[model samples]
Target: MINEIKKDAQERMDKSVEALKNNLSKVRTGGGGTEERRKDLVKIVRGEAEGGRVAVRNIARDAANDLAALGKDKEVNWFDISQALWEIQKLTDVAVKKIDEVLAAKEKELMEVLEHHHHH
Candidate 1:
């Protein structure tokens, strides 16, 4: 039962991050990028990242509740639960930072290409 909870949390957390990455992958950086395109890209990336954060948080919340309830049955492994939750929190933070990194790098790349296009 404890392991089940850990597994579910892990899977859901990974899916959330994967979804964010998928959403980001839809963004195309080629062609002559315009100011409007960059603006829209920021909005889309931020919105997707926020949605990912919410999804991950929800999974953690449900997992925490499940673990808490398991405690009443005396079947809960406190150490395992703590470690799982810690991992979830760490993943959440890491995902957000990763998204921001992508956002910044992608935007910079787009601008560079856009500038190069106009200079030619």
Candidate 2:
């Protein structure tokens, strides 16, 4: 039971990381930028980030439930189960932080452009 919970949590984290990586590729890293292209990229990144957030949260909840069930069944060691839960929580925190960084960068870019154009 503990192994299953750990496996599922790892899988979920892997998927979230992959999605974030793909989304990052769509963001403008350097060089020239087209307004339309940047807008589309922002939309894609926002959607991917939102999806990742939802997926991670759902997986965390599911893993917690599974851990509780395992505790009730007495088939797994609490120490190992708690360790797996802690790891999942840490990974989720990292994922959320990455998403926030991406969103903040994009927001700053857009706000700067808007403020500049506002004077014109």
Candidate 3:
């Protein structure tokens, strides 16, 4: 069951990463300054970022589930399980925070590029 859960998690993460990659190629061929193109590009990036957020959250959920399953082990104490749960949540918070930072960076960079090309 543990292996199955891990495999499913990996598959989901892979799909999420692949979607992010695909969105990068969704850039418009037309002038970046064009309102339609600008909106489209922004929309794609936003969607990509949201997908990333969701993906990380899903991983966190999987982790929580795994931690919860540890309860089924007769030898493991409840205190230890509680600690594990806290650790997973902390890591999840950090990962999600990093994702947010990356998203912001991407948004800023994309905006600058679009604005720069607006004068072209």
Candidate 4:
């Protein structure tokens, strides 16, 4: 009975880990190196790439608004705006990778447990 319980617990742990990994990949982080990358990571970390995109857009919009607010007398740095957009894209990619790593780790753990069980 104890063995059965252990086996069940291990199985549950394995499943839970997989689920966590899957969820983690879906989280989205804003334009930063600290963002999660994988779809599962997004799910686990509550990351939203779409949300990040929206935020980036909003930032661009706000910058444009500021430029407008300054009127025709103000000069906007198109180069800076372009660079910011590029950075956002890069950050989004990094965020995705971050999430993927989390999922991969969880998957590894789950696989290890399964392998251990099989060996036994």
lDDT scores in order: 0.71, 0.71, 0.64, 0.42
Residue range 16-91, candidate 4, lDDT tens digits: 4455455544443322222223234335343433334344344434444443444444364555445544544454
**Cα lDDT tens digits for candidate 2, 9-67:** 87877788677767666575244345665576677667777887888788888888887
Model 4 residue 81 CA deviation in Å = 0.3
TM-score of each: 0.73, 0.62, 0.68, 0.37
Model 1 pairs in collision: none
Q: Rank order by lDDT, top first?
A: 2, 1, 3, 4
After superposition, candidate 2 runs with Cα above 4 Å error: 23-44, 102-120
The alpha-carbon deviation from the true structure for residue 103 of candidate 3, after best TM-score superposition, in angstroms, is 1.3
Q: Give one digit per residue, the lDDT tens place, for model 3 in 1-120.
A: 444554565566556655665665565434455445566677777777787878867886977688678788987688876766676566556656765665666555555555446454
Model 3: weakest 10-residue lDDT segment is 27-36
Query: Between the candidate structures 2 and 3, which one is better when assessed by TM-score?
Result: 3
lDDT of 1 by residue, 1-120 (tens): 767886787788878777777877787645565677766776777777778878877887888788777667656577776776776667567656765676676566545654346433
Q: How does model 3 fare in lDDT?
A: 0.64
Highest TM-score: give the candidate number.
1
For candidate 4, the C-alpha RMSD (Å) to the true structure equals 19.6
Poorly placed runs, candidate 4 (over 4 Å)? 1-74, 114-120
